[PDB]
Write a protein that binds this ligand. Structure first.
Ligand code: CLA
Ligand code: CLA
Ligand code: CLA
Ligand code: CLA
Ligand code: CLA
Ligand code: CLA
Ligand code: CLA
Ligand SMILES: CCCCCCCCCCCCCCCC(=O)OC[C@H](COP(=O)(O)OC[C@@H](O)CO)OC(=O)CCCCCCCCCCCCCCC
Ligand SMILES: CC1=C(/C=C/C(C)=C/C=C/C(C)=C/C=C/C=C(C)/C=C/C=C(C)/C=C/C2=C(C)CCCC2(C)C)C(C)(C)CCC1
Ligand SMILES: CC1=C(/C=C/C(C)=C/C=C/C(C)=C/C=C/C=C(C)/C=C/C=C(C)/C=C/C2=C(C)CCCC2(C)C)C(C)(C)CCC1
Ligand SMILES: CC1=C(C/C=C(\C)CCC[C@H](C)CCC[C@H](C)CCCC(C)C)C(=O)c2ccccc2C1=O
Ligand code: SF4
Lengths: 742, 73, 39, 30, 152, 74, 140, 146
């Protein structure tokens, strides 16, 4: 009986607990004896498990916290639209997108910082943005700062509404546990509701606002003279003159003459050659079809009627000779453990973001996006990092599930048990394949560096020597290029100009996309990716499989998820906790993503991006140097890092100088992280003793007794500054380089 | 012996190199000084030191080495 | 209200207000008397 | 060349192999 | 002059630097209409640049071969504005902060749960101690002379 | 000249760290508190907090200001 | 008088990669026994879930610490009593726990002090006073 | 710091323009760009896709030094317990792999000691530190003779 079940006035709204730091925790609430209190207060703030063991009361906390996050995002979007409206050159940028640099931030004149207001065109001075908002607003048919002002007010309203709902669904009407557990209703309402009615209603905007307004923009008529969006709704003839399918109205839709709509609903593929982005008629037809699939998919699971499955039935029906009982018991686990849910969602949301990175570069979905080399290098890198972080988060809450929620007596599952029963076979196999990968990927580079140093370039793994051609990738490329005439007859051109074949698309003399060649160097850097990803999974998967126990620590699960070690005995047990595996996996995730984005930057500058001639002579940014240079480590040192770092280290005295300072600053924070990772709190606590003595000598010691950070905090502080400094360095290196040469 | 006759125009040689991994371009590039084969140039300053204190001939150096070998023993 | 005044006195809140006030003061001294290297 | 072609493989292949084999037997003995 | 330097008001490389700097800003200035907001802004930077260079020249700053002011902190009386004077001001303020800070830990040290006023500021108490800092040299010297400043 | 200066300053650095490392080892293996009672060596142990916290102060002063000055210039 | 060791049945377990290795054949291994009032699932110290049988229960384990970890879990969760032993490759058995029939947490007469120094820790001599003797300060 | 300083003061002396040091040394971007980056160009070209020269050894040792140093970071950042559990799964795997079953170790494989790893990491760190800087020092100075 799926119904709305809510409790009335569970938690009284009062500032009483704002005045009581650590009220959520019974230990923390008593107040500080030492400075360690300060940190545990923050480390435990969102660990709703440790606050209360009641699953209903935990779910209410995560529900209202989600509203809190949505409030923050809307407020974030409000400012993005507000700055486009009030502090931007978007209106000027619409008239000349090939030349004017998007800018939506202006610094006040103080202490000489005006120099960051750069000559970006359009009679404007500001910081060049790489979020890509301008390409979005154009593709949405936004034509004035007035339209951004109204979107910013709506975002601000939604921010208040989301905040109100969070307070409302925690203090006034808090859903009962069984309401959250109705996973069938939720899946139906998200497939059909969120995904379905979102893609359908957005398709409506693309049809009635985005398609027509972009046709005027691409025809060349001034945005101040393009008819306002509501005129294409009030007066159909405006639409019909651009797409005569609207003349017959909604009649061809219901009469199954859908082919009549073939002028604004297409299957062309490739890129609009006068704008550089995907065809807005292909995109609108995409959201249309996608909306249909989700509206029907939101009818799969059973609710208040008869049709539909119980998700438990589908799970309990899949099991084999090698697996036994199979997926039985998973429905109780995924309806009682928030961390099991969070592990899967982080895994997939992370993976999906990495895909968004690839698809958005090879099939640029926004007009004049592909030729804004700075925006596109930022978008791909930004989503790689977001994706890689979310993935490492999946391993933590998978590990947290094993320590806290796993219970074979109440919620058994033979699939999970079967893996636990041979975790030594899994981890040892992943260990060996990692050793194989490392030797047969990175070792080839070392071969090349040593061969090239000895004056023996004939013995290298090179396109001009021992060639390692990626035959299988080359084959897939040549296949997709022949799909539009053959295996995809309805498709006019390939889904991407990257597909080894076709021609080229340019916007404003700048190359947008051409076929991307894959040779020996692409073979090497792809086996680095497989190596680095494998080691990341090795560390993280090992952390979850031995989170409860190991031959070394039989009762590890009793030590919790997050604990420093179990002491110097057994030869030493530092970093046995699953939490420490997540700590080590972040460094490897960082490693893997760093060379992925380096791979991306060098390839694009070398073999894709560049300027096209009057006659078609393409001059790439680094002139095809990727093939002979990227097969030795010295090639990455010299031809990539040393050469492309030019821009950032000579940015002083120009509007790019803030990247100069961030380049050095992030180096600093990165080196600073090593103090924490290389040392240990015993040293620091003794040091503090001598310092405390000095304070006592002058009657200035605090009653909150100073303590060294805990062992785990030291590690957390270390990896946090390591990742921040590391990534920020590449950030300042990428933006300076691409804004100066893109 | 060539260094002591022209100390500002001769890169001092540390020792010969004999590495069967070398390709021919590495054999040429490392053939420097007045030597007949690949060599390393000395950055230890022993030529200036030994010359300043009186050493002049390869023989001077040989009997010095033998004497230090005796002291080692 | 007294609970709110207690929270407004908690270390982080009192710090941002203190340092915000400080930053405003130093910024305005630098807008009125910029580029001071001597004194 | 008539002597380096003798001593370089001797000190870089033979001696380390003879040394590594010698030390392997002393450290493993009981 | 001191340390082989020359007054920035007589220095040719100092003057060159101002000239190259204004020329840099004028290259940007010429992009924009003269009434426009960027033109006013770049012009504001230009005037501030001119005020700065004349100010350093009139304050007596010595310049090196680089055309940049170099500070004389040795004690020489023509250069007290470069260290002694802002330094006395720093020590006066720094001692004020520390003396006030110690006043608060002492004021709360005999309280019931002293760490409670360390994580939740007793702002009323603090407004009463904040001006003890004005006279820290006299107060700190006085606590010294009568055994109150250091513990034994 | 570059190799010679660099070679000896690194040799000197390692040698200086060994000098303190064997001071530490002296204090553990060999130091007899009773036969050094109240002498200049024992008195160093008596006021170790004074010694250590002033090195700490001197290092903090030099780090804040040296780094602060370079960062200002940058 | 220490308990005995027959050939009682073992819990129901499908096998795992966590069990005994060559050390058991050549050095030693351990066996824990216990009596349960009913069949029930429990977690194996080597990974996975097994079902203990009602009544007698024998389990071979590779390490002493694995035994005590399982046994500590038997008292807390299952409230059952347990013992374990060290088995050598010659078949020689050695009773281990609870040593004198009494768990070591509770005082029991007949136990003799081992390793007790009758002084506070801070009264250990300096290392120089035991140099070239074979003793550490904590040995006196 | 002291050797960077000695070298950069002398290389700009030897080159006949102390002013490069007098001006670029008062800020840290100057050291990074006008000392490290400027003086690396001959060294990193000791071998390139176009051939090699006598600076090839130092280019290779330069990277070798970066590699040893970075390997030190492993022993310094990851600590023992992680590696002891991993080695155990390799003990298992070795005793369950046919043919390889026949061969047996005489010394039980164990992760390095806590202290041992601090040392091994320190040694890697120090070794790569010294080899990186010596390669740079020698190549940059000898590639032009100051
Ligand atoms: C993610 C959101 C975001 C971000 C990062 C920024 C960032 C910026 N905005 Mg912007 N803005 C946003 C959203 C955002 N905005 C939205 C949604 C609006 C519409 C309401 C605006 C409207 C707006 C205007 C009108 C202006 C800016 C300006 C600026 C710049 C300077 C701001 C400054 O120094 O304030 C000054 C700093 C403060 C006011 C901080 C005071 C410190 C107090 C003590 C903190 C209080 C803490 C307290 C405990 C919590 C209070 C919560 C309360 C709101 C309930 C800066 C780049 C300025 C600019 O670009 O000038 C050229 C400018 O004039 N923004
Ligand atoms: C003024 C309105 C109001 C009042 C008086 C209360 C009062 C209370 N709430 Mg409630 N709540 C409200 C609004 C309010 N709530 C809203 C709008 C929501 C939706 C998010 C919730 C959601 C909510 C949950 C989910 C929970 C409470 C809890 C509580 C109790 C203690 C909370 C506490 O210590 O807060 C003090 C906390 C803060 C001041 C934290 C600030 C909160 C915002 C969201 C942080 C955002 C900062 C942002 C990240 C920027 C920082 C980053 C950058 C600076 C680096 C207390 C009875 C808790 C409780 O009773 O459990 C025992 C509990 O679990 N409430
Ligand atoms: C939707 C995503 C999501 C959600 C809801 C959670 C939720 C949770 N995680 Mg999880 N996690 C995630 C993603 C997520 N995580 C990802 C992506 C990773 C990989 C990095 C992890 C890694 C992880 C670990 C390793 C641990 C958790 C823990 C927790 C729990 C406690 C969190 C807490 O109190 O922190 C309070 C939050 C803070 C103290 C914030 C600290 C400040 C951060 C680290 C720095 C941010 C820097 C910023 C981006 C740059 C600004 C710099 C500027 C200020 C100068 C909570 C259930 C902890 C636990 O025990 O769970 C039970 C735990 O130990 N998570
Ligand atoms: C550049 C520095 C560096 C290097 C080389 C390694 C190397 C390795 N790490 Mg590691 N690590 C590092 C830094 C580094 N790490 C840091 C900073 C951290 C802290 C976050 C870690 C944390 C970490 C963890 C947590 C894990 C690893 C793992 C691995 C192994 C991956 C498998 C592999 O490729 O083996 C092949 C080895 C190489 C590719 C190294 C180069 C080999 C050379 C080129 C061949 C030499 C041939 C021959 C021997 C010549 C020498 C002759 C001589 C004796 C005379 C490998 C041994 C994983 C592991 O053990 O998986 C098996 C693992 O789980 N590391
Ligand atoms: C390295 C150590 C050192 C130290 C501690 C000082 C300290 C001082 N110098 Mg200085 N000075 C130094 C090296 C040093 N100097 C060198 C190497 C030079 C050569 C360039 C100078 C050149 C120099 C000049 C030209 C003057 C100072 C002055 C001063 C005084 C600062 C103002 C003051 O408080 O007057 C208080 C003065 C006193 C309490 C007594 C000072 C007289 C006695 C004999 C000393 C102070 C005593 C000034 C001074 O003495 O002003 C009166 C001043 O005119 N110094
Ligand atoms: C009442 C505040 C106060 C006072 C009077 C002192 C005084 C001293 N400290 Mg201490 N210290 C403080 C706070 C304070 N400290 C805090 C908060 C920290 C944590 C960051 C430290 C950490 C620290 C270290 C690590 C060292 C000293 C040292 C010293 C001595 C030499 C001066 C120095 O290095 O300053 C250094 C000052 C700092 C590093 C930071 C303190 C600055 C904060 C901003 C001032 C306190 C603000 C406080 C919130 C005021 C609230 C009052 C209000 C409620 C009315 C001297 C006894 C050194 C020493 O022992 O030499 C013998 C030394 O090695 N201190
Ligand atoms: C670049 C990296 C780096 C940096 C900056 C430091 C910094 C420091 N180390 Mg450390 N260390 C490092 C690497 C580094 N270390 C490594 C690799 C190791 C090997 C494990 C060690 C091992 C080590 C030991 C064993 C000791 C030190 C000590 C010190 C202190 C030296 C005194 C000093 O400079 O005071 C000045 C302080 C600083 C320069 C720190 C940075 C100050 C920042 C920039 C001010 C921030 C202001 C700004 C408002 C912050 C905004 C941030 C925002 C998010 C809120 C200082 C805190 C000694 C110490 O504690 O002496 C008292 C000490 O005993 N370190
Ligand atoms: C890989 C081939 C493959 O997909 O095998 C599939 C194989 C067959 O599984 P079952 O048919 O037992 O599974 C039935 C259900 O549990 C899954 O739907 O599963 C295994 O035994 C996993 C083998 C892991 C072996 C890793 C190597
Ligand atoms: C951007 C933005 C924004 C905005 C948004 C908007 C503007 C939205 C709108 C939206 C919309 C405005 C939507 C709509 C919707 C609609 C729908 C979803 C519909 C549906 C329908 C249906 C389902 C149908 C049915 C049917 C059928 C099937 C058959 C026949 C009959 C009928 C027709 C009945 C905001 C401010 C928030 C924030 C920031 C950003
Ligand atoms: C300028 C001049 C001069 C003067 C000089 C002088 C007077 C100097 C001094 C110097 C010095 C005066 C130095 C010092 C140094 C120091 C050191 C470097 C130390 C160290 C130490 C240590 C390392 C220790 C250790 C230990 C321990 C810890 C424990 C016990 C034992 C021992 C002791 C071993 C003259 C007149 C000639 C003239 C010319 C000019
Ligand atoms: C350097 C560091 C130390 C010491 C660093 C700690 C003590 C951090 C100190 C943090 C702040 C600066 C303490 C003071 C915080 C107060 C809020 C400051 C109030 C003053 C006002 C300006 C706000 C250890 O704790 C240690 C932990 C274990 C692994 C190695 C590490 C690590 O290497
Ligand atoms: S070193 Fe730190 S972490 Fe490693 S064992 Fe000893 S205490 Fe535990």
């Amino acid at each position: 009986e799926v119904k709305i079940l809510v409790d009335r006035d569970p938690i009284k709204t009062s500032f009483e607990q704002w005045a009581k730091p650590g009220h959520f925790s019974r230990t923390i609430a008593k107040g500080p004896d030492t400075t360690t209190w300060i940190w545990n207060l923050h480390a435990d703030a969102h660990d709703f498990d440790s606050h209360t063991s009641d699953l209903e009361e935990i779910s209410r906390k995560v529900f209202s916290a989600h509203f809190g996050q949505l409030s923050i995002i809307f407020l974030w979007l409000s400012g993005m639209y507000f700055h486009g409206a009030r502090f931007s050159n978007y209106e000027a940028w619409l008239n000349d997108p090939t030349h004017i640099r998007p800018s939506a931030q202006v610094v006040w004149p103080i202490v000489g910082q005006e120099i960051l207001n750069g000559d970006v065109g359009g009679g404007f001075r500001g910081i060049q943005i790489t979020s890509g908002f301008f390409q979005i607003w154009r593709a949405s048919g936004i034509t004035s700062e007035l339209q951004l002002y109204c979107t910013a007010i709506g975002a601000l309203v939604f921010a208040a509404l989301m905040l109100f709902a969070g307070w409302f669904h925690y203090h006034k009407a808090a859903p009962k546990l069984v309401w959250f557990q109705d996973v069938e209703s939720m899946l139906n309402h998200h497939l059909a509701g969120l995904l379905g009615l979102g893609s359908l209603s957005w398709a409506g905007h693309q049809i009635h606002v985005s398609l027509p307004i972009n046709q005027f923009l691409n025809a060349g008529v001034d945005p101040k003279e393009i008819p306002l969006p509501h005129e294409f709704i009030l007066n159909r003839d405006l639409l019909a003159q651009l797409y005569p399918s609207f003349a017959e109205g909604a009649t061809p839709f219901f009469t199954l003459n859908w082919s009549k709509y073939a002028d604004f609903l297409t299957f062309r593929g490739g890129l609009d050659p006068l704008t550089g982005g995907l065809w807005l008629t292909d995109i609108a037809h995409h959201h249309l079809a996608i909306a249909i699939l989700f509206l029907i998919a939101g009818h799969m699971y059973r609710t208040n009627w008869g049709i539909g499955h119980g998700i438990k039935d589908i799970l309990e029906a899949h099991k084999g000779p090698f697996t036994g009982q199979g997926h039985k018991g998973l429905y109780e686990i995924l309806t009682t453990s928030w961390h099991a849910q969070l592990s899967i969602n982080l895994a997939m949301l992370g993976s999906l973001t990495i895909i968004v990175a690839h698809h958005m570069y090879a099939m640029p979905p926004y007009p004049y996006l592909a030729t804004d080399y700075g925006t596109q290098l930022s978008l791909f890198t930004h989503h790689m990092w977001i994706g890689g972080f979310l993935i490492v988060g999946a391993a933590a809450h998978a590990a947290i599930f094993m320590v806290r929620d796993y219970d074979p007596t109440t919620r058994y599952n033979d699939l999970l048990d079967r893996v636990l029963r041979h975790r030594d076979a899994i981890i040892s196999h992943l260990n060996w394949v990692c050793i194989f990968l490392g030797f047969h990927s990175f070792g080839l580079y070392i071969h090349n560096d040593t061969m090239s140093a000895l004056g023996r370039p004939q013995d290298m793994f090179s396109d001009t020597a021992i060639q390692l051609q990626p035959v299988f990738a080359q084959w897939i490329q040549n296949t997709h290029a022949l799909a539009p005439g053959t295996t995809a007859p309805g498709a006019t051109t390939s889904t991407s100009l990257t597909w080894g074949g076709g021609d080229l698309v340019s916007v404003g003399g700048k190359v947008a996309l051409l076929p991307i060649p894959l040779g020996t160097a692409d073979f090497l850097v792809h086996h680095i990716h497989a190596f680095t990803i494998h080691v990341t999974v090795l560390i993280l998967l090992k952390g979850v499989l031995f989170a409860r126990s190991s031959r070394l620590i039989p009762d590890k699960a009793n030590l919790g998820f997050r604990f420093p070690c179990d002491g110097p005995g057994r030869g030493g047990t530092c970093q046995v906790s699953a939490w420490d595996h997540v700590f080590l996996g972040l460094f490897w995730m960082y490693n893997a993503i760093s060379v992925v984005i380096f791979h991306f930057s060098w390839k694009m500058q070398s073999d894709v991006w560049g300027s096209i001639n009057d006659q078609g002579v393409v001059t790439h940014i680094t002139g095809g140097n990727f093939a002979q240079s990227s097969i030795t480590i010295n090639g990455w040192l010299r031809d990539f890092l040393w050469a492309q770092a030019s821009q950032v280290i000579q940015s002083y005295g120009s509007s790019l100088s803030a990247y100069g300072l961030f380049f050095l600053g992030a180096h600093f924070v990165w080196a600073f992280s090593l103090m924490f990772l290389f040392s240990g709190r015993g040293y620091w606590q003794e040091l503090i003793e001598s310092i405390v003595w000095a304070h006592n000598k002058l009657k200035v010691a605090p009653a909150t007794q100073p303590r060294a950070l805990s062992i785990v905090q030291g590690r957390a502080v270390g990896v946090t500054h390591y990742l921040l400094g590391g990534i920020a360095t590449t950030w300042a290196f990428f933006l300076a380089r691409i804004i100066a040469v893109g | 012996e060539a260094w002591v006759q022209d100390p500002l125009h001769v890169r001092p040689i540390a020792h010969a190199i004999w590495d069967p991994h070398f390709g021919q371009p590495a054999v040429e590039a490392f053939t420097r000084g007045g030597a007949l084969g690949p060599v390393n140039i000395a950055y230890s300053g022993v030529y200036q030191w030994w010359y300043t204190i009186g050493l002049r001939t390869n023989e001077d150096l040989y009997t010095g080495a033998i004497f230090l070998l005796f002291l080692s023993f | 209200m007294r609970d709110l005044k207690t929270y407004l006195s908690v270390a982080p809140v009192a710090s941002t207000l203190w340092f915000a006030a400080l930053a405003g003061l130093l910024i305005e001294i630098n807008r009125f008397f910029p580029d001071a290297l001597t004194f | 060349i008539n002597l380096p072609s003798l001593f370089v493989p001797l000190v870089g292949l033979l001696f380390p192999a003879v040394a590594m084999a010698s030390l392997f037997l002393h450290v493993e003995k009981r | 002059d001191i340390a082989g330097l020359t007054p920035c008001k007589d220095s040719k490389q100092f003057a060159k630097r101002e000239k190259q700097s204004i020329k840099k800003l004028e290259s940007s200035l010429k992009l924009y209409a003269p009434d426009s907001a960027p033109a006013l802004a770049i012009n504001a930077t230009i005037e501030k640049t001119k005020r700065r260079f004349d100010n350093y020249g009139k304050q007596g700053l010595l310049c090196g071969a680089d055309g940049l002011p170099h500070l004389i902190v040795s004690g020489d009386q023509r250069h007290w504005g470069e260290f002694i004077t802002p330094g006395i001001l720093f020590l006066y303020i720094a001692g004020w902060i520390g003396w006030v800070g110690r006043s608060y830990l002492i004021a709360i040290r005999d309280d019931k749960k002293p760490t409670q006023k360390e994580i939740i500021i007793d702002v009323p108490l603090a407004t009463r101690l904040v001006f003890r800092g004005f006279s820290w040299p006299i107060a700190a010297y006085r606590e010294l002379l009568n055994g109150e400043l250091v513990a034994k | 000249q570059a190799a010679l200066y660099t070679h000896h300053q690194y040799i000197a650095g390692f040698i200086m760290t060994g000098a303190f490392a064997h001071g530490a080892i002296f204090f553990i293996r060999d130091y007899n508190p009773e036969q050094n009672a109240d002498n200049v060596l024992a008195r160093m142990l008596e006021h170790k907090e004074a010694i250590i916290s002033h090195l700490s102060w001197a290092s903090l002063f030099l780090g804040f200001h040296t780094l602060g000055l370079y960062v200002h210039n940058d | 008088p220490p308990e005995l060791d027959p050939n009682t049945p073992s819990p129901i377990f499908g096998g795992s990669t966590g069990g005994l290795l060559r050390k058991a054949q050549v050095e030693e291994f351990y066996v824990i026994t216990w009596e349960s009032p009913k069949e029930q699932i429990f977690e194996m110290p080597t990974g996975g879930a097994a079902i203990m049988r009602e009544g007698p229960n024998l389990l071979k384990l590779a390490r002493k610490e694995q035994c005590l970890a399982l046994g500590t879990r038997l008292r807390s969760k299952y409230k059952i009593k347990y013992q374990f032993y060290r088995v050598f490759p010659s078949g020689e058995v050695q009773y281990l726990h609870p040593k004198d029939g009494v768990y070591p947490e509770k005082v029991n007469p007949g136990r003799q002090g081992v390793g007790v120094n009758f002084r506070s820790i801070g009264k250990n001599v300096s290392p120089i006073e035991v140099k070239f003797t074979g003793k550490q300060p904590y040995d006196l | 710091w002291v050797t960077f300083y000695w070298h950069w003061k002398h290389i700009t002396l030897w080159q006949g323009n102390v002013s490069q040091f007098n001006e670029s040394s008062t800020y840290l971007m100057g050291w990074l760009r006008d000392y490290l980056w400027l003086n690396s160009s001959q060294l990193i070209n000791g071998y390139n896709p176009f051939g090699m020269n006598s600076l090839s050894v130092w280019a290779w040792m330069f990277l070798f030094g970066h590699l040893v140093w970075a390997t030190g970071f492993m022993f310094l950042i990851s600590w023992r317990g992680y590696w002891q559990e991993l080695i155990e799964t390799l003990a298992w795997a070795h005793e369950r792999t046919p043919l390889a079953n026949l061969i047996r170790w005489r010394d039980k494989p164990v992760a390095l000691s806590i202290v041992q790893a601090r040392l091994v990491g320190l040694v890697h760190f120090s070794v790569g530190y010294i080899f990186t800087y010596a390669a740079f020092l020698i190549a940059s100075t000898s590639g032009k003779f100051g």
